[PDB]
C-alpha cells in the first residue's frame, strides 16, 4: 500500500513560523508533525511513503527525511488536486494532508483494508470553515460542501482518504476554478456519483495546524495525552516540582526553579536558577530559561533562549530566538477583548481573551522590549532596545518604532 502526504500548501496563515520551516515540521513536543504522521502510517504497515512538497521546500524535506520519497508539486498549478497529480499510483493509496495532527492511527489501519474509496470525517464546532460531508441515506458520501457559511452538518472532511486510481479520471474532468486552484474535493465529488465512497467517523482528537495559536492547541493536547512524568535530566537541590513534568535527557534545572506541571522540558535545556515554569510550558529542545524568567502556556522551539527578567505567556516562539533581558510579552489587551491576529491580510479573532505573540526563527529582541498581544514578529527581525512592538514586524526587519 502506498501513502502520499500532501505537504505543498503555502503555509501563509501560519507565519511567522513558516518563514523558516514547512508547516510539516512544526514541533509537537520534541517531534515534528510529519514524524507523527510517518510513525502512524508505519504502524499500519505503510512504508512506501511519498511527501509532495513545493519546489522551494524540496531541499528542506530531503535533508530531514532519509527514508521517504519526496516529489515536488508541478510549479504552474495549485491546490490539493494539483498535489495528487504528482502522486504516482495504480491500484489505490492512502492520502493525508500534511498539516493534520490526530491522536492515533486506528482509522488509517482500518481504511486501508477496504476495497472502496473511503474518506474520514470528523465533527468540528466551526464547520463553515472546512469541507462539510453530506451523506446519503446509506451513510456513504453524497457530496463535500466547501466552506458553506451555513452548517448542514457537524461532520467535515478530515483530509484522510483511501482512494483508488479512479480518482485521476475525475481529476481530469475537473474545471478549476473560483480560487485559481485544482481542488481534490471537486474530483471526489464527481467520483462519488459513480462510485461508492465510504465515510468513516474519526472519534479521537483531530486538529489542523492552520493558524499559529493551533500550535499551542496541539502541543497542549500532546502534553496531556502522549507523555508521562519522567526525569532523565539533572535537577539540583531546592527545585520545586508539582504535577506532571517531563525532563528530557541532558536537561539541567538549577536551584530556585519552581515548576507547576504539566510542563515539557526538552533535551539539552538549561533552566534556572530561579526560573518559574507554569502549566503548559513546552520547551522543545535545547532551550535556555534564566533567572527571573517566567513562562506560561507557550511553545518555545529549538535552541531558543529567554535568559533574564522576562515573561512569556500564551505565545509561540520559533527556533534560535534570543530575548534581550527584560523583554516582555503582553497576553491581555487594555480593553480585555478577544485578541485579533493579522492572518493573510485579514483581522482574525483568535477565540482567546489571553494570547501573546508569535515570534519567527532567529529573531533577537533588545533589552526592555515590549510586545503587544497577538503581534507577529517575522523571522530574522531585530528589535531595538526599549521598543514597543505595537504592530506586526516583517520578515528580516529592524524595528524601532
Ligand atoms: C495541501 C496542499 C495545499 N495546497 C494549496 C491549496 C491552497 O492554495 C492552499 C490552502 O491549503 P490549506 O490546507 O487550506 O492551508 P495552506 O497551508 O495550504 O494555505 P495557507 O497559505 O492559506 O495557510 O495551499 C497545494 O498547492 N498543495 C498541497 O499539497
- In degrees, to the nearest 5, what angle opens at C-alpha 17 toward C-alphas 354 and 348? 45
Structure obtained using: X-ray
**63 grid coordinates:** 535533508
Are 26 and 17 in contact by the 8 Å Cβ rule? The answer is yes
Q: Give the dihedral sign, CA 181/184/189/195.
A: positive
Element spanning 144, H or E? strand 141-146
Give the phi and the psi of residue 186 in degrees, each rounded to 5. -65, -45
Instruction: List the residue whose alpha carbon is closest to atom 13 of ligand 1.
Output: 9
* Residue nearest atom 21 of ligand 1, based on CA coordinates: 12
Cα gap 76→63, rounded to integer Å: 24
Residues with Cβ within 8 Å of 123's Cβ and at least 6 positions away in sequence, in order, are: 154, 155, 156, 201
Q: How far apart are CA 380 and CA 363, in angstroms?
A: 5
b/e sequence 176-202, b meaning 16+ C-beta within 10 Å: beeeeebbbbbbbbbbbeebebbbbeb
d(CA 163, CA 165): 7
**Cα 271 to Cα 293: distance, rounded to the nearest angstrom:** 9
Give CA–CA dist 381/399, Å, rounded: 7
What Å distances lie between residue 311 and 17, 112, 276, 399, CA to CA? 20, 47, 10, 20
Which position has the grid cell 529573531?
A: 363
Residue 345 is given by DSSP the state: T
- Please list the alpha-helical segments (H only) found in 124-281: 167-173, 184-194, 212-225
Cβ(181)–Cβ(85) under 8 Å?
A: no
Peptide linkage before 6 cis (omega within 30 of 0)? no
C-alpha cell of 107? 482509522
Q: Tell me the C-alpha distance between 3 and 196, whole Å.
A: 21
Q: Are 141 and 197 in contact (CB under 8 A)?
A: yes
| Alpha carbon of 9 to ligand 1 centroid (Å) | 3
Q: The dihedral of CA 150, 156, 161, 163: what is its sign?
A: negative
Task: Dig out the grid coordinates for 4 from the structure.
Answer: 502520499
Cα 363 to middle of ligand 1, angstroms: 26
The residue behind cell 495528487 is: 84
Ligand 1 centre to CA of 12 (Å) is 9
Is the distance from the beta carbon of residue 181 to the nearest atom of ligand 1 less than 6 Å?
A: yes
Whole-angstrom Cα distance, residue 293 to residue 277? 8
The CA R_g of the chain, rounded to the nearest whole Å, is: 22
Domains and CATH numbers, the chain: 1-210 (3.90.550.10), 211-401 (2.160.10.10)
- For the Cβ of 252 lying below 6 angstroms from any atom of ligand 1, the answer is no
Residue 19 CB partners (closer than 8 Å, separation 6+) = 318, 360, 361, 378, 379, 380, 395
Amino acid at each position: 500500500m502506498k501513502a502520499f502526504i500532501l505537504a505543498a500548501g503555502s503555509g501563509e496563515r501560519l507565519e511567522p513560523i513558516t518563514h523558516t520551516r514547512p508547516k510539516a515540521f512544526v514541533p509537537i513536543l520534541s517531534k515534528p508533525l510529519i514524524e507523527y504522521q510517518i510513525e502512524y502510517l508505519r504502524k499500519c504497515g505503510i512504508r512506501d511513503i511519498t511527501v509532495i512538497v513545493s519546489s522551494k521546500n524540496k531541499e528542506y524535506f530531503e535533508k530531514k527525511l532519509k527514508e521517504i520519497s519526496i516529489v515536488t508539486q508541478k510549479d504552474d498549478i495549485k491546490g490539493t488536486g494539483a498535489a495528487i497529480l504528482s502522486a504516482k499510483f495504480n491500484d489505490e493509496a492512502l492520502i493525508i494532508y500534511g498539516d493534520l495532527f490526530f491522536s492515533n492511527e486506528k482509522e488509517i489501519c482500518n481504511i486501508i483494508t477496504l476495497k472502496e474509496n473511503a474518506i474520514i470525517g470528523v465533527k468540528v464546532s466551526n464547520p463553515k470553515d472546512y469541507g462539510v460531508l453530506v451523506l446519503d441515506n446509506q451513510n456513504n458520501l453524497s457530496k463535500i460542501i466547501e466552506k458553506p457559511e451555513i452548517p448542514p452538518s457537524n461532520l467535515i472532511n478530515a483530509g484522510i482518504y483511501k482512494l483508488n486510481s479512479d480518482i485521476f479520471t475525475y481529476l481530469d474532468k475537473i474545471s478549476i476554478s473560483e480560487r485559481g486552484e485544482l481542488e481534490l474535493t471537486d474530483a471526489i465529488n464527481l467520483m462519488a456519483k459513480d462510485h461508492r465512497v465510504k465515510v468513516i467517523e474519526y472519534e479521537g482528537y483531530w486538529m489542523d495546524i492552520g493558524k499559529p495559536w493551533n500550535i499551542i492547541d496541539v502541543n497542549k493536547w500532546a502534553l496531556d495525552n502522549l507523555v508521562f512524568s519522567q526525569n532523565l535530566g539533572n535537577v539540583e537541590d531546592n527545585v520545586k516540582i508539582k504535577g506532571k513534568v517531563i525532563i528530557e535527557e541532558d536537561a539541567e534545572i538549577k536551584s530556585g526553579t519552581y515548576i507547576e506541571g504539566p510542563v515539557y522540558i526538552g533535551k539539552g535545556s538549561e533552566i534556572g536558577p530561579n526560573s518559574y515554569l507554569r502549566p503548559y510550558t513546552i520547551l522543545v529542545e535545547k532551550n535556555k530559561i534564566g533567572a527571573s524568567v517566567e513562562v506560561k502556556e507557550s511553545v518555545i522551539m529549538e535552541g531558543s533562549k529567554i535568559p533574564h527578567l522576562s515573561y512569556v505567556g500564551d505565545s509561540v516562539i520559533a527556533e534560535d530566538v534570543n530575548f534581550g533581558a527584560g523583554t516582555l510579552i503582553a497576553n491581555l489587551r487594555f480593553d480585555e477583548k478577544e485578541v485579533k491576529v493579522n492572518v493573510k491580510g485579514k483581522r482574525i479573532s483568535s477565540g482567546r481573551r489571553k494570547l501573546g505573540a508569535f515570534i519567527g526563527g532567529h529573531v533577537r529582541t533588545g533589552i526592555n522590549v515590549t510586545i503587544l498581544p497577538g503581534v507577529k514578529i517575522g523571522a530574522y527581525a531585530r528589535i531595538y532596545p526599549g521598543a514597543v512592538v505595537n504592530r506586526d514586524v516583517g520578515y528580516g526587519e529592524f524595528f524601532k518604532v
